[PDB]
Each structure stands twice: as structure tokens, then as C-alpha cells.
Amino acid sequence: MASETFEFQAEITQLMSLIINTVYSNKEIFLRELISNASDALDKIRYKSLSDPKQLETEPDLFIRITPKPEQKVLEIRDSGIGMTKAELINNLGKSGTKAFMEALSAGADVSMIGQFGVGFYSLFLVADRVQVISKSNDDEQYIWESNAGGSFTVTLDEVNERIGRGTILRLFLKDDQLEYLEEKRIKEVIKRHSEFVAYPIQLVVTKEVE
Amino acid sequence: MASETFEFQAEITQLMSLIINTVYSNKEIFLRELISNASDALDKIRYKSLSDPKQLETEPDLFIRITPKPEQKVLEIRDSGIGMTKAELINNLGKSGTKAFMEALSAGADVSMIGQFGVGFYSLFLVADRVQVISKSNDDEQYIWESNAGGSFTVTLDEVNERIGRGTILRLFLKDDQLEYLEEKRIKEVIKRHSEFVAYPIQLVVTKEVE
Ligand SMILES: O=C1NCC/C=C/CCC[C@@H](C(=O)NCc2ccccc2)C(=O)Cc2c(Cl)c(O)cc(O)c21
Ligand SMILES: O=C1NCC/C=C/CCC[C@@H](C(=O)NCc2ccccc2)C(=O)Cc2c(Cl)c(O)cc(O)c21
């Protein structure tokens, strides 16, 4: 099952290198950005369902779900939002609040403004050196978008991951010095601090040994 | 991706109908049987690794993991044991401690003896009317074995489930009147009662809303 490869627009590669290498000390804000994007995608599928309730049937429950996978150094953020088709994955993450945000950064803006420029997605490279976006839109098959902060990304039909009824999984491959965010206490703390007003249940998946 | 279909040996179909329809009141013993089978598979991969440690590299951690999926009425029991190939799935579950166990039942034996006759796997039909066995052996690709208590089962190359490094997932589709076993308290209780001496960590995956 072959993967297709695509090149990032110049201003994206720049931003991503301008973030994976940063020594900025408030790295935890990535989670607010991802939760926000999730909330948005949920809003869209819900708004859409107003004039077509059948859209919900692929996944009746509207939720945000966070799943640490410590043994893999992975953190997953899932939502049952509207999702993205193959074309949307290729196009959407391929533009500029970018150049303008980079300019604000140069002038001393705090990285946390990133979401204001509509490019908060890339805040994930604060804690991760690699990401897979797994997405299922009602209008397409499930696909995997993958990037390692480099200049190119891949898109591949998904034949290896669990079936999403509908929506998106952000699978973050955390940096060796950020395993921090695999911990339940740490995670809940970050959520309480920046995501107080979310209209959708935020679920935490925790694995505990029975003793 | 086509599924292959196979017919059960006569004495298996019988046993399975002789269990899905039973009014036996101590249904919880299914979990002990499945945990035991898991422990066995872990023993085997560990014993095997004695003369070939590389066998462990597909999944270094040896564990039993229980994951309720309430919204799907599903309970999953996973282990990182030795797993089963396509041929093993077709053959292994296709024989008789069977006929002998059925005879013991007719005479008044308790269903809990089932494991003594080497057919404890089928105790799952006490709480489930459908099961998928998802398995990954180091020697084959990942496959799905599926049965609905009928006379035939299917085997299909797995292109829809999460990747198992190595081992087996029993995915139980619980009966409407047995959702019971999706609850953390209920589950831990059953484990403590019948699986005190398990050499491997038994993990429980619990999903909780952040509030
Ligand atoms: O699935 C998602 N969005 C719903 C469809 C609407 C998209 C509108 C524009 C925002 C969207 C986006 O930036 N997509 C481009 C993109 C494509 C591939 C990878 C990353 C980003 C977008 O936010 C994609 C997205 C992200 Cl980044 C997320 O963390 C969670 C999500 O549910 C989604
Ligand atoms: O993967 C498993 N076993 C390791 C390989 C050794 C098998 C030895 C014989 C027991 C085995 C078995 O009954 N297999 C036949 C079978 C084939 C297909 C579906 C169900 C059962 C067997 O117990 C398969 C098995 C079950 Cl049922 C389970 O609940 C958990 C498991 O890890 C395994």
C-alpha cells in the first residue's frame, strides 16, 4: 500500500523548523491549540448536522478523547468532528497567517498567540518531533497524513490503524525530554488551565494495573 | 478485501449453542478463562524467547490488558503472547475435550469446569453473542477470526484494526443484558476473585471525563 509524498509550501517548512528547535519554556500550550481545533471540527459536524442529521450516524457521540501511550512515547488527541478527506489533508496542511505570525515572533510576540494567526496546529512541534494525522470524513476513506518537521509530508490510505467512525486523531510522537505529557496528573492540569469552556466532553484514557 | 468462510466441527457448533442459550447464573467465569488463555500465550512466547530472545522485539512488554468500549457494547481482552497465524486460527478453533465436557454438563457438572476440558474459550458465549479474535503471530500477518455462535466462522486479513505488535485480542460483543462487564468496579472484582496468581500485569483501560 503505497504512500504519496508532497512538498510543503516554503513558509510552512520555515515555521516548523522555527518551532521544533525553539527553547521557549511554556511548551504546554500545544494542548490548548489541539483541543481548540478539535472543538472547531466538532462544531462544524454539529452545525452541518442541523440540515442533515444523518451525518451524525457514523459516530453519534461528540467527544474529545486524549490517550497517552507511554510505551510508545505517543500522545493521541481524538475527536469525532467532521474530519478531513484525502484532498483536504493534502491541501489544508500544505496559507499565511504563517508569515505574519513569524514576523510577530521576531518582534517578541509570545508563541501562545499562534492560534490567533490560525496556525496553532504547528504548536505540536513544541513537544513532538513527528506527527501523524489520522482522519475519517464521511465523504472519503480513512487516511494518514505524516510529517517529521522536514520539507515533505506523506498521505497514505489507512490500513493499519483502528477504524474511526468519523473524525480525526492527532498522534504525537513526543520528544525524549517531554514524556511529561504522558502523565494523567500533568494532562488534567493543562486542560483545567486553558480549556475551561469547551462545549464537548474531554475524556482521558488512563491505563492502570489491577492489584 | 475478501473474507474466507469455514465450517465448525459438529461438536463445536453444539457446544456453542449449548452455552449462548444457557440460563446458568454464574456467567462471570468467562473472564477467568480468557485471562488464563492469555497467561498461557504469554508463557509460550516467554518460554520460546529463552532460545531466541529476538522473538520479544515485536512487543517487548508482556501484559494482559482489558479495555471496555461501552458505546459499542464491547469488551476487549488483549495480551502480548505468542499469537496465532492464519493457519492456526483456522485449525485451532475449528478437538474433543468438547464431547466429554458436554457429557459432564449433562450429568450436572458446573460450567466452571470448562477450562479443565481445554475448551474454556467458548465460555465467552455466556456473556457475548459474537466474538472477533484478532491475532498477530511473529510468523504471519494480522488476521481476524469471527464467530456468531453459528455453524461457520470467517477469517480475514486485518486491514481495519489497530496494529498489534504481537499477540491476541479477544473482542467480545456483549449481550444487551450483560453490559455489566463494561464497568471498572465489576471487572476488578471478578479479577480479584479468580485471577489472584497471574505472573503478568493485568492492566485495566478506563476512560473518564475531565471535570
Ligand atoms: O479534522 C479537523 N478539522 C475539521 C475540518 C476543518 C478544517 C478546517 C481548517 C482547520 C484544519 C486544518 O488546519 N487542516 C489542514 C491540515 C491538514 C492536514 C494536517 C493538518 C492540518 C484542522 O484544524 C484539522 C484538524 C486538526 Cl489540526 C485537529 O487537531 C483536529 C481536527 O479535528 C482537525
Ligand atoms: O493466542 C492465543 N494462544 C496462543 C497460541 C497457543 C494456542 C494454543 C491452544 C489454545 C489457543 C486456542 O484454543 N486456539 C484455537 C483458536 C483459534 C481461533 C479462535 C479461537 C481459538 C488459544 O487459547 C488462543 C488464544 C485465546 Cl482463546 C485467547 O483468549 C488469548 C490468546 O492469546 C490466545
From Swiss-Prot, chains A, B:
Present with 444943 molecules/cell in log phase SD medium. It is found in: Cytoplasm. Induction: Expressed constitutively and induced by high temperatures dependent on transcription factor HSF1. According to PubMed:2674684, it is constitutively expressed at low levels, however, due to the specificity of the antibody, this result is unsure. This is ATP-dependent molecular chaperone HSP82. Changing residue 104 to N: Induces a 6-fold increase in ATPase activity. The TPR repeat-binding motif mediates interaction with TPR repeat-containing proteins like the co-chaperones AHA1, CDC37, CNS1, CPR6, CPR7, HCH1, SBA1, SSE1 and STI1. CNS1, CPR6, CPR7 and STI1. Keywords: ATP-binding, Chaperone, Cytoplasm, Nucleotide-binding, Phosphoprotein, Repeat, Stress response. Its main location: cytoplasm. Molecular chaperone that promotes the maturation, structural maintenance and proper regulation of specific target proteins involved in cell cycle control and signal transduction. Undergoes a functional cycle that is linked to its ATPase activity. The nucleotide-free form of the dimer is found in an open conformation in which the N-termini are not dimerized and the complex is ready for client protein binding. Belongs to the heat shock protein 90 family. It comes from the Eukaryota. GO terms for molecular function: ATP binding; ATP hydrolysis activity; ATP-dependent protein folding chaperone; identical protein binding; unfolded protein binding. ATP binds at residues 33, 37, 79, 84, 92, 95-97, 116-121, 168. Changing residue 167 to D: Induces a total loss of function at 34 degrees Celsius. Abolishes interaction with SBA1. Homodimer. Interacts with the co-chaperones AHA1, CDC37, CNS1, CPR6, CPR7, HCH1, SBA1, SSE1 and STI1. CNS1, CPR6, CPR7 and STI1. Interacts directly with the substrates GCN2, HAP1 and STE11. Changing residue 98 to I: Causes a 90% reduction in ATPase activity and a reduced client protein activation activity, leading to growth defect at high temperatures. GO terms for cellular component: cytoplasm; cytosol; nucleus; perinuclear region of cytoplasm; plasma membrane; protein-containing complex. Changing residue 22 to I: Induces a 6-fold increase in ATPase activity and a reduced client protein activation activity, leading to growth defect at high temperatures. One of its GO terms (biological process) is protein stabilization.
